[PDB]
Symmetry: C6
C-alpha cells in the first residue's frame, strides 16, 4: 500500500508524515487529457480533514492558489517518490463532501494553467534510476 | 460506527441522544459544489420518523426554516463532534419516502448561507484545532 | 418482516389479515416530491393478485377512485400502524406486470390530495405521539 | 418453479405438456402500461425453438395474427392456471435471437385488444374467485 | 457446451472440426429485428484468429461477400445442427479487437440483404425431427 | 498469461524483456472500426512508467510520431508474436493517469492513439506450437486506400 500526498499552497492537511507533514493525504486520484486539446480537472479523493473548510471556501470564492503538487511514494523499504505532478495557478472547481454512520470522504477537483510531471524509474535495488520530466503551459498553449 | 445528527428549526426528530435530543438521526448524507459557482442541494438519508410528515409539508409549501445544522460525532470513548455544517435560510427541496416488507427517506436541503467547522482530533482523542469558513451564497 | 397494506376503493386485494382483509399486500413502495413543487406518482410493488385485472382496466380507462390509503405496520408483539399515507382523487397511471418460470407487479398512483400520519413508538412498543400533515396538491393548498 | 405458456395462432412451439402441446414455453415475460394511455409491447423470453423461424418472418412481414394467449400455471399438486392474458390482433414487433458456446430469444408483441383473467387460489390449493377485465386499445374502449 | 460456427465466403478461420474446417468458431452471437421494419446488424464474438486481418480489410473497404452462414450444433452424442442462419450479400460493418495480458477476443458485426433461418427439432432419441424454414428479402422488401 | 508490448518512436517504456527492451508493456488494449468508415482511436492501458511524462507532452502538443507497433506474444515455451498491429503517423489523443493507496501500487494510465495507416499481421499456431501461416492486411485510412 503506497502513500499519496498533495501539497496545496495556503490549504494544509493533517498528514503526520515527517517528509510531507501538514499535507493532504490522497486516497485516490485521476486525471484526463483529450483532443487544441482539452485538459480535464484533476480529481482526487481524501477523507474530510483540516483542509475541508478551506477547500469549500476556495471553491465558492474561486480564488487562485499559487501551486499544487501531487506526489506518489512507493511503500516498503524503498520510499521513492516515483511520480510528482506539479500544477501552477490552481483553481478549486469542485468539492463533494459525504458521510455515513456505518464507517467520511471528500472528492475535490483542481483546475490549473500549468502542469509539470516528473517520473523516476526504480531499479532492482529499489533506488532511483532515470528521471523523466515534461512541462507544458496549458493557458499559454 | 459514528453518529450523525441534523437539527432543523421547527422540524423535530426522535433521537434519544442526551446532547442531541429531538434531532434527526442521519444514516448518510452528501453535498456538492461545482463551478460564479453552483451550490447543489444537500442530500441526507434518514429513517421515516416524526420529522417526515413536516418535511413533506414544508417541501410542498416551500416555506423557509431559519437554520439547519448537520453534525458528525465519532464513536468509542472519544465522542468528538468533528464536523458541524451550519446552513441558514434552509428550504426543503426534495423528499423521497420509501418502504419495504425498516424504511428510509431521502431529503434534500437548499440554503442561502453555509458555515463549516472541522475539529482535528489529537492522539488522546480530544479536540485539537478548529478550522471554520463561512460564505453567503445568496449575496455572493 | 413488517406488513404493508394498501386500500383502494373499488379495487380489492386478497389479504387474509384480520384487520386488513381484502386489501393489497404491498411488498415495497416509494414516493418522491421535487421542486410550485412537482409531486411524483406513488409507486408500489405487489404480487399479481385479485386486484391486478382491475388495476389494468382503471389504468387504461383512467377513471378516478375516491381514496387510496397506504399503511405500514410493525412486526412482533407490537403491531403498531406507524405510517398511514392517505391519498384522495387517485388515478392509476402505470401498471407493470411481470412473471418468471424460475410473480410481481409494479403500479404507480397519482392523486390530488395527500395526508401523512406518523406514530412514534415508545420503549414498551406502544403508541407515543402522532404527527399529521395534509396538503391539497391540485388546489395548491 | 411454475410453467408459463404462450399460444399464438399460426405460430406453434414444441411444448410437450399435454394441456399446452405445441405452444411456446415462456421462460419469463413482462408488460407495461403508462399514461389516453400508452400501451407498451408485451415482451416474453423463450429458448430458440420451432416458433423462431416463423416469429422472424412475421416480424419482418408485419402480418397480423388472430390471437395470442399467455397462461401461467402453478407448480406442485395444484396445477391451476391462475393468469390468462388474451391478446387480439397481435403483431410481432421485435425478435432478438442469441446464442453462446457455454440459447434464448426475446420477442415483443403488439395487440389491439387485451383481456386478463386472474384466478384466486384458496389455502387448500383449489380455484376460488375469477376476476376478468377487457379493453379495446385500438378502439379506445 | 455446444459448438457454434460461421462460414464467410473468402474469409476463412482456423476451426479444426472436420465438418466445419477453416470456419470461424463463434463464442457468442446476437441479432435483433425491430419495427417497414428495421433489421439490426448480426453481431458475433470470436477469438482473434486467421480471419481477423481479413475482417479488418472488409470493414475498411466495405466490400461485399457472397454469403455468410451461421450454424449452431448440439453437444454430446447427438451432433445435430439445430439452427442455420444464412445471410446473402453480407457487409462487414464493425470490428472490435481487444486483448489483455491476463487471459483475446474480437467482436464483429455483419450487415446482409437477405436472411434465411432453418431450425430442426430434436426428438427424444437425439435425432432430427421437423425442419422449419423461413426466408425474407430485406433489401427487396419481400 | 501472455505478454503485450507497444513500441512507439521517441516514447520509450521500461520493459526488461530482451526482445522488447525499453518498450511499453501493455496490460490491456482495445480498438474499434465502424461504418466511408469510421476508425476509432486505439486505446491501451499501461502502468505509469517512463513513457508517461512524454505521453502527456505529446497529447498536449499534438506532435506526430513516425510509427507505433503493438505486439501480442504467446506465453509458455513458444514465444510466438501471433499478432502485430503497425500504425503509421500516430497521434496521442488521450491520456488518463490514475492512482490509489488501496490497490498494490495502483498506477495505471489509459492512452488512446490516432493513426493514418494501419497494418495487421496474424500468425497461426499449429499443433506442436510452432508458427503456421501469416495473414497480413494494410490500409491507408487518411488516403482512403
Amino acid at each position: 500500500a503506497q502513500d499519496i500526498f498533495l501539497k496545496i499552497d495556503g490549504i494544509n492537511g493533517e498528514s503526520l508524515d515527517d517528509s510531507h507533514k501538514d499535507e493532504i493525504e490522497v486516497l485516490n486520484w485521476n486525471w484526463e487529457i483529450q483532443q487544441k486539446a482539452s485538459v480535464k480537472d484533476l480529481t482526487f479523493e481524501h477523507a474530510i480533514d483540516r483542509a475541508s473548510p478551506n477547500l469549500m471556501k476556495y471553491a465558492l470564492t474561486g480564488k487562485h492558489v499559487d501551486q499544487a503538487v501531487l506526489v506518489m511514494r512507493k511503500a516498503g523499504g524503498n520510499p521513492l517518490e516515483y511520480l510528482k505532478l506539479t500544477m501552477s495557478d490552481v483553481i478549486i472547481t469542485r468539492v463533494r463532501p459525504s458521510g455515513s454512520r456505518d464507517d467520511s470522504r471528500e472528492t475535490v477537483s483542481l483546475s490549473f494553467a500549468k502542469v509539470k510531471q516528473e517520473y523516476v524509474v526504480q531499479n532492482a535495488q529499489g533506488g532511483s534510476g532515470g528521471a523523466v520530466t515534461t512541462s507544458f503551459d496549458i493557458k499559454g498553449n
